Structure formats: structure tokens, C-alpha cells
Design a protein around this ligand. Structure first.
Ligand SMILES: NC[C@H]1O[C@H](O[C@H]2[C@H](O)[C@@H](O[C@H]3O[C@H](CO)[C@@H](O)[C@H](N)[C@H]3O)[C@H](N)C[C@@H]2N)[C@H](N)C[C@@H]1O
Ligand SMILES: NC[C@H]1O[C@H](O[C@H]2[C@H](O)[C@@H](O[C@H]3O[C@H](CO)[C@@H](O)[C@H](N)[C@H]3O)[C@H](N)C[C@@H]2N)[C@H](N)C[C@@H]1O
Ligand SMILES: [Cl-]
Ligand SMILES: [Cl-]
Ligand SMILES: [Cl-]
Ligand SMILES: [Cl-]
Ligand SMILES: [Cl-]
Ligand SMILES: [Cl-]
Ligand SMILES: [Cl-]
Ligand SMILES: [Cl-]
Ligand SMILES: [Cl-]
Ligand SMILES: [Cl-]
Ligand SMILES: [Cl-]
Ligand SMILES: [Cl-]
Ligand SMILES: [Cl-]
Ligand SMILES: [Cl-]
Ligand SMILES: [Cl-]
Ligand SMILES: [Cl-]
Ligand SMILES: [Cl-]
Lengths: 257, 256
């Protein structure tokens, strides 16, 4: 645990080093595990270096000694305006959940940049519901079952499990997450889910010790049917054609035929 | 006999789409029916390219074909944005270059016909992600140490999703047209580390049985196996990464 003090010193030391290196820098922020305070042995030191130069996107890596160990350091160098702007795009690592991308401002070039970038996180909105593609992936599962392709079953079930949260988010209390592992935690904790959710979702994701093509296909059939019957038929939320088809009973008829 | 009525349904839908979209310049058949490998639950997949800029919309019908219902979908998009899309890697291919099958059904003029009547649309391979593969191994290691099985499984999936970006440059070039074929092509890579085919499925979590312990062991084998097979080229892997590997420092970090 004296490793951790050497890392904190490495972080402080790197901030000044990054400044010296990037004349176009306007702000330097700590990200990831060390910004959250939950780092462990193999955690990386993660920096964003925001610059004034437009269209810049580069990725730096260092391996540096801390006592008798080496630590991995990384920096994403990015145009400041591009970095601020991506707050309107959903994260790709949260299964569609809205996110709080943890930031700790280390340095900023002036007062106004300081005031603007001194926030505990950068937000991202939820990914939109994908009813149609969830239903298609169930179709792929059924096709793979019919032809005896277990691997195809497992693959398509992952697609169903990756998409289902986009359906469950709107009918659950608002929750955000700050990192990938926590996304699994928030989803598993959703108060409003169909019967069997926890085990079914992990089976379909493939994050279990034991399953079969039969049990996996079964989990997906339960989940899709259970979730669709819980969804409000709102055209702005789900899409006009989708809500219409659900209200007409056509989507149900299709799935159950 | 069901698939024959589908063919007639397809032809009928093109006329329909033309009539509904005045701003249309082309309609293309995509997916299973464009490949000719469709089955019972396959969907009829259309791209409807419009002259109207910045348009992105997604349509859905459910239609009778004899004694069954068929799912029909249309992606409506600015013709020019559709065309520009070739510069980005597909999201569904584990980083493999792709040939998105395209069968042009209708085009507004002879020039549009010629610009668009192509057998597929291409996307390039995703670039190698050495750093993120190593980080995900780091996460697996932290997860094991705290007894978090789910964390091990999750971060092993990350390792497995990135490893193909590493194997592509040391293997004969291959492209795929759909997601299921991506798995087949990757399992068929001839130049891979010891244990690759079995381990990759284990880490992806596409197997009947594994444990946190066996999964971590697979990812350790894999990552160490793949890195020693990579050329230390700055253009391929990135400047820092190549330097660090050539210096021995990345290996030292991973094995410490
Ligand atoms: N995966 C987790 C890591 O993601 C990012 O870094 C990673 C970048 O996202 C990676 O960039 C990749 O993802 C970005 C964003 O999609 C793409 O623009 C880029 N072309 C693509 O290569 C880049 N090649 C490596 C860098 N470590 C974070 N900055 C740090 C985080 O720990
Ligand atoms: N996943 C396979 C399907 O992918 C696409 O469609 C799907 C679109 O890709 C989906 O759009 C999603 O993906 C696109 C592209 O990333 C995003 O721009 C969009 N915001 C996001 O919602 C849209 N919401 C549903 C539509 N069926 C293909 N056009 C059809 C294919 O069967
Ligand atoms: Cl992290
Ligand atoms: Cl939101
Ligand atoms: Cl799908
Ligand atoms: Cl998955
Ligand atoms: Cl998906
Ligand atoms: Cl994580
Ligand atoms: Cl967590
Ligand atoms: Cl209807
Ligand atoms: Cl329904
Ligand atoms: Cl397909
Ligand atoms: Cl066919
Ligand atoms: Cl071509
Ligand atoms: Cl995965
Ligand atoms: Cl990934
Ligand atoms: Cl597929
Ligand atoms: Cl295969
Ligand atoms: Cl190495």
C-alpha cells in the first residue's frame, strides 16, 4: 500500500510533464480507477489531455517504474471542443445505460476553462430502445436452433442480452454508472424486470459457468416475451411503426406464430 | 413454398417503397435474402437511399406471406452519407474487414444505377488495440484477486473482442459478410497462438462450461501468446506501443 502513494506521486508528476509536452493544452483531467479512488494492483493511470488544436485525436502510453513495480500510464489527447461535445453521445461500454464518466480536473490554462471543466464527471445519455433488433436477434436464435448451430445460438443470445437493457431503462428508476463492471451491477439490480431476469440475462450474455443451446434459447424466449409485455406503447420512445405494431397485436402475433 | 411468396413480396415492396418515398434514388436488398441464405425467421432487409440530406430513419412492417407473417424493415438514409460509410469498420465483425452484401433493386437513373449496382459495400479492418487488450487482462487480474467471477467473465470478453484486431495483420486477409461468419473466419485463422481456437470461445463466453479460473488462464495464455507474434511496427501498432515492446518494457509490465 506504499505502492499507492508512489502512484499518487506519479500522477502529480505526470500532470506537469503533460503540460510541458503539449503547448496547445488547455486542460488535464484524471480519469478511470484513480479518479474514482477504487484502483487496484493492475489499474492503469488514465489521463485526458484536452488541446486547442482542432481534430486532434491521439493516444499515448507509458510504462514507468514505481518502486519495485511498473505502472501503465495512458493519455488520450483530444480537441477540447470535440471532447465536450461527445457528452451527447451514449457510451459504448454501458449496455446502453446513461453514464457518469468520472473526471478530476488536474490543471486548466485559465479561470474560465477551469470553471467550465471542473466537474465530477462528463455525462452521456441512455442509448435508445431497440425493439426491432431485439426481435431479430431472437429470430436468429430460432434459426440457429433449427439448424443445430449451438455457437450461433450463443452468439445471437448475446445480441439479445446486449439490447434488452435499452428496453428496460425507460421503465426503471433513473440510474447512471461510471464504468463497465458497474453497468452489470445496475442492470442486475433493476427493480422492474420480467420473471427470471438475473439468471437469464447472464446466461444470454454468456457470463455463466454452465449453459446449453436449449437453456440459452429458453432464457431469451422468456426475456423477450416478458419484456415486450412490460413496455409502454409510446411511438416517440419506441418508434412509430413499432408502437403501432404492438398496439395492433401484430408484433405479438409475429413472435408467437 | 413460403420462400417463393417471399420473393414475390420483395418485388412488391420495392414498388411500394418507391411510391412512398418520392425523394428516393435507390432501393437495395440487404442481409439474408440478398445472400440467398435466409431461413424461417429471417427478415426482409431494405436500404432506401434518399436525396434528402441528413435523413436517418428506420421503418418496420409485419406482413402476411400466405399462412405466415414476415418481418420487413427499411433503413432510410441520405444517399451520400450511406456512400461515405465505407471508411469505418463494421461494429459486428470483431474488427474484421467486411463486405456488406448489397443487391440493388431499383435506381432512379442510369448514372445512379451504375454508381450503386455493386455486389457489396466494404468496410476496413479495425486497427490493432494492444493497449486495451493489456488493460483488460489487468482488469481480469484485479477481478480474480477480489473473487469477482462476473468481472473476470466480463473483462475476458473484452480481451476476446480485441484479440482479432491483433491477429489480422499476421494472418492472410479475410472479409466476412455477416456476424456469424465473423466467428467462423476468426476460428479459421491459420497463424494463432497455442490454444487459440478453444480459448477464444471460452473468453468470449460462447461455451458450455468454464470457470473464472479456467477463463483467466485462457486469457493469460492468449495475451502472452499473441503479443510475441506481433511485429513491433510503429505504423501498425502506434509509436509508443511499438517502442515499448521493442524495449521489452510491455512484456516486463505484463509479467511482473
Ligand atoms: N478501452 C478503455 C480505454 O478507452 C479509451 O482509450 C482507448 C481508445 O478508445 C482507443 O481508440 C479506439 O476507440 C476510439 C473511440 O471509439 C476510436 O476513435 C479509435 N479510432 C479507436 O481505436 C485507443 N486505440 C486506445 C485507448 N486506450 C480511454 N481513453 C481509456 C480507457 O481505459
Ligand atoms: N442490427 C442489425 C440491423 O442493423 C441495422 O438496422 C437497425 C439500426 O442499426 C438501428 O439503429 C441503431 O444503429 C445505428 C447505427 O449505429 C445508429 O445510428 C442508431 N441511432 C441506432 O439506434 C435501428 N434503431 C434499428 C434498425 N433495425 C440494419 N439497417 C438492419 C440490420 O438488420
Ligand atoms: Cl476503468
Ligand atoms: Cl437519459
Ligand atoms: Cl440481429
Ligand atoms: Cl456479450
Ligand atoms: Cl448489439
Ligand atoms: Cl470496469
Ligand atoms: Cl460494481
Ligand atoms: Cl399495423
Ligand atoms: Cl407486443
Ligand atoms: Cl443477417
Ligand atoms: Cl433465400
Ligand atoms: Cl466492388
Ligand atoms: Cl462479447
Ligand atoms: Cl471491446
Ligand atoms: Cl448473422
Ligand atoms: Cl464456425
Ligand atoms: Cl511484448
Amino acid at each position: 500500500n506504499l505502492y499507492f502513494q508512489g502512484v499518487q506521486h506519479t500522477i502529480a508528476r505526470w500532470v506537469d510533464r503533460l503540460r510541458e509536452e503539449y503547448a496547445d493544452a488547455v486542460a488535464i483531467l484524471l480519469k478511470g480507477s484513480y479518479a474514482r479512488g477504487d484502483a487496484a494492483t493492475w489499474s492503469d493511470i488514465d489521463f485526458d489531455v484536452l488541446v486547442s488544436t482542432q481534430d486532434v485525436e491521439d493516444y499515448r502510453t507509458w510504462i514507468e517504474p514505481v518502486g519495485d513495480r511498473l505502472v501503465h500510464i495512458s493519455a488520450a489527447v483530444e480537441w477540447v471542443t470535440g471532447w465536450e461535445r461527445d457528452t451527447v453521445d451514449p457510451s459504448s461500454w454501458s449496455y446502453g445505460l446513461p453514464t457518469q464518466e468520472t473526471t478530476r480536473l488536474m490543471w486548466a490554462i485559465n479561470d474560465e476553462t477551469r470553471r467550465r471543466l471542473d466537474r465530477p464527471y462528463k455525462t452521456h445519455p441512455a442509448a435508445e430502445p431497440e425493439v426491432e433488433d431485439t426481435v431479430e436477434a431472437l429470430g436468429k436464435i430460432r434459426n440457429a436452433i433449427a439448424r443445430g448451430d449451438d455457437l450461433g445460438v450463443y452468439q445471437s443470445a448475446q445480441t439479445v442480452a446486449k439490447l434488452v437493457p435499452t428496453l428496460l431503462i425507460p421503465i426503471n428508476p433513473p440510474v447512471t454508472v461510471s464504468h463497465a463492471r458497474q453497468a452489470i451491477e445496475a442492470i442486475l439490480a433493476f427493480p422492474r424486470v420480467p420473471v427470471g431476469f438475473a439468471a437469464d440475462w447472464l446466461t444470454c450474455l454468456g457470463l455463466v459457468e454452465e449453459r446449453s443451446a436449449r437453456s440459452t434459447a429458453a432464457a431469451a424466449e422468456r426475456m423477450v416475451r416478458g419484456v415486450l409485455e412490460m413496455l409502454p406503447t409510446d411511438p416517440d420512445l419506441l418508434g412509430e411503426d413499432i408502437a403501432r405494431l404492438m398496439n395492433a397485436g401484430l408484433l405479438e402475433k409475429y413472435v408467437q406464430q
